[PDB]
Structure 1
Amino acid sequence: PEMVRGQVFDVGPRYTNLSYIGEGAYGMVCSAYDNLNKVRVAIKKISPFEHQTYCQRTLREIKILLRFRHENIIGINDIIRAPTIEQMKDVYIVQDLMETDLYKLLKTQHLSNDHICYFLYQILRGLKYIHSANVLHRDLKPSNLLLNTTCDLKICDFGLARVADPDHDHTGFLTEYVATRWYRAPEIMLNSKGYTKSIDIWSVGCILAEMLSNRPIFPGKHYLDQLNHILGILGSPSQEDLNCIINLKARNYLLSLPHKNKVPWNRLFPNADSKALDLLDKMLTFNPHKRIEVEQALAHPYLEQYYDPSDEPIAEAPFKFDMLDDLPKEKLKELIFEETARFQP
């Protein structure tokens, strides 16, 4: 078995000429030559079976990606694992080889307005399909947006996804932990479990602002700091928006703050396209009920060069209910085994 940087990489014989790329908490990514298709691919080794939550995230990612087929969502081309549960200690997910991601790109590269428009269109095209499946990504950020050498964008990492459930979204103050901090909508800190599609639109808004300046728009230094940065730019929420927050702890916290004025987007982004800033404002709306939805965003004038609803497909059949939670890791392993059987031998 071929080894890479310490780990076993038991992908033979189809995948050769392995090359290290990255690493995670319980995973490792390598590029590899696929002799059958004669192209270099990405292979992600996952070792989740010692932990309840790793098994959950692995199962979610595999279940969703095997049911999705969309140009702006990374596919699963192959899955490699032992022939029996007893022998399965890792799972290898084979995917299209992508040159970079948006996080690495924004660290060094300035984006032209045409590139910003093109990336944003592809993000929203993929999001439309995801939301049309009644699924919430729930961790959209630059590092989860892959790009190849011709700037084709693909959304990845559905390990934190959920089936939408707006009827059960309301919760209490400062208790929820959804998405990555800089891309986390204000209502998560206030009164939302993150079970509504507007959670994802906020993240996309944060990404767009980051594409405009190469800096995160809301760089909170810890969980509790994030709302400071959001309100420092959006200003104090209106009385109408506060009336939509029935939770008293959340509403009274906002009421205890001094008045802050909105900072105009054109002062923060003096070089930006005015149409881009109009859309940015509609995605970074404080009130999630007033926040623009994915199909409205696709139709915004900023994207009129690409907008084509007949070329923005939706899912063949949505997820009807959330899968799971209290299942032991032994059962999750069996379900991961069962979900990956179609790629055997």
Structure 2
Amino acid sequence: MPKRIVYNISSDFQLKSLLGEGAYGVVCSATHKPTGEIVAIKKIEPFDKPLFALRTLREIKILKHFKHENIITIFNIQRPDSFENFNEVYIIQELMQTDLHRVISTQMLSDDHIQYFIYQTLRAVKVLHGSNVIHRDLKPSNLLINSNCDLKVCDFGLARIIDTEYVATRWYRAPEVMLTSAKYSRAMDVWSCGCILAELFLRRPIFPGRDYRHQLLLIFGIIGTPHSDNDLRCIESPRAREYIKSLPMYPAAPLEKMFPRVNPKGIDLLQRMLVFDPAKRITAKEALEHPYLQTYHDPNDEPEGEPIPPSFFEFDHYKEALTTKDLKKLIWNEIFS
């Protein structure tokens, strides 16, 4: 483990390996000496900028509010010693074996495993959506996987309650999001799920855009360029509609020929997810009922979720901006709840 990685945690924990390292979070596996149980600990420094603190607060509230087989299980959160020296949050969770990005990049998955993985992802999206929560950052690296192929979603800080900012990786973001100030919608998560399913089939990301322009170019190269007014109707900005009209007119690609080895039923489901008009995209519930997933579908074992009021994230609607001191107290009081 790199010496540059410093955790200020209980002596009952012995850090083992670095699992993830970014500008927002750092994740390591650790041995809980007292029990010999190995866990994952996510370290976050949330108070340099408001966006980091907001992301931290949403992540911990969602983690502590949800209980679902396809949502990572949180075990504990370190209790800070003093409000003054409180500058790091440590989230203790169940240790998973790997993540779907690593699996896709290292394994030749069978159609059955692809079905099971997308099924579990959609089952988690169903409960979030039924609770009026959109994830906004679904992608393979945020899907945790165990040896028995159980999949659990993580990284809930970019979530919003449906009623500078961190944004999802461009490769998995819905087109309408990069074309205007689109209203939050469940359809954006479904788009990400479509990108994840396409990636499972292709074994590499399907829309690896180098930038905003390129991303839209790759997307339309596959789903087809919306041409008529009716198609361009979902786009609010007239400037955005004009820009789309300046792109080449691509027809929808023949996926049956683009994926001759893939299960036809899987391609059908994929085409129902990667639709330009967000309103025409299949819902998570409908996707679970799709023939491609009949082996796993169980209408009596797919939690619908319970509505969460927007006030759960009341801070997202503040007029007079929140100070970092305001956010520090909010996170502190959430830890002790």
* One of 331, 336, 340 as aligned partner of 2:335: 340
Q: Shift in Å at residue 147 of structure 1?
A: 0.4
* Counterpart position of 1:44: 42
Q: Give the CA deviation at 1:317.
A: 4.0
Out of 198, 204, 207, the residue aligned to residue 215 of structure 1 is 204
Q: Distance in 1 between matches of 2:144 and 2:236?
A: 39
What secondary structure, in the 3-state scheme, does the structure 2 residue paired with 1:40 have? strand
Q: Offset at 1:25?
A: 1.4
Structure 2 distance, partners of 1:232, 1:57, is 34
Which residue of the partner structure matches residue 284 of structure 1? 274
Q: Aligned equivalents of 1:225 and 1:238: distance in 2?
A: 18
**Would you say how many aligned residue pairs link Structure 1 and Structure 2?**
331
8 Å CA contact 1:71–1:154 kept in 2: the answer is yes
**Which has the higher mean CA deviation after the structures are superposed, 319-328 or 76-85?**
319-328
Moved over 6 A (4+): none
Aligned to 2:85: 87
1:194 CA drift (Å): 5.1
Whether the 8 Å CA contact 2:132–2:307 is kept in 1: the answer is no
Aligned pairs for 1:316-327 (under 5 A) are: 316-321=306-311, 322-325=313-316, 326-327=321-322
The answer to whether structure 1 residue 241 and structure 2 residue 239 are counterparts is no
Aligned to 2:115: 117
SS at match of 1:310: coil
TM-score, normalised via structure 1 length: 0.90
Distance in 2, matches of 1:46 and 1:258, equals: 44
**Distance in 2 (alpha carbons) for counterparts of 1:16 and 1:254:** 54
Instruction: Provide the identity percentage.
Output: 52
Name the SS for the 2:189 alignment partner: helix
Deviations 1:50-93 (A, max 9, x none): 22111111011011111111110112110014232113221110
Work out whether residues 162 and 310 of structure 2, in 8 Å CA contact, stay in contact via their aligned partners in 1: no
**Match status 1:180 vs 2:169:** yes
Q: Which amino acid aligns with 2:272?
A: K
Deviation at 1:15, TM superposition (A): 2.2
SS in 2 for 1:250: helix
Deviation at 1:230, TM superposition (A): 0.7
TM-score, normalised via structure 2 length = 0.92
Kept after mapping to 1: 8 A contact 2:176/2:235:
no
Cα distance, 1:297–1:49 mapped onto 2, change above 3 Å? same
Match of 1:271, as an amino acid? R
In structure 2, distance between residues paired with 1:199 and 1:127: 11
Q: How does 1:128-147 map to 2 (within 5 A)?
A: 128-147=126-145
Letter in 2 for 1:335: L
Q: How does 1:296-311 map to 2 (within 5 A)?
A: 296-311=286-301
Partner Cα separation in structure 1 for residue 305 and residue 195 of structure 2: 25
* Cα shift readout 1:125-171 (whole Å, capped 9, x = no counterpart): 00001111111100111111110111110111011111113xxxxxx
Question: CA 1:282/1:35 → structure 2, altered by over 3 Å: closer, same or farther?
Answer: same
Give the letter for the 2:210 counterpart.
K
Q: Which runs of 5+ in 1 are unaligned?
A: 166-174
Change (3 A) 1:44 1:177: closer
Q: 1:75 — aligned with what? A: 73
Q: Where does structure 2 lack aligned partners over 5 or more consecutive residues? A: none
Q: Structure 1 residues 207, 5: CA separation in 2 closer, same or farther (over 3 Å shift)? A: same
Q: RMSD over aligned Cα, in angstroms?
A: 2.1
CA distance in 2, matches of 1:194, 1:73: 25
Give the match for residue 190 of structure 2: 201
> Structure 1 stretch 13-22 or stretch 24-33: which is displaced more?
13-22
Deviations 1:317-343 (A, max 9, x none): 42334423521111111111111114x
Aligned letter for 2:93?
Q
What secondary structure, in the 3-state scheme, does the structure 2 residue paired with 1:286 have? Answer: coil
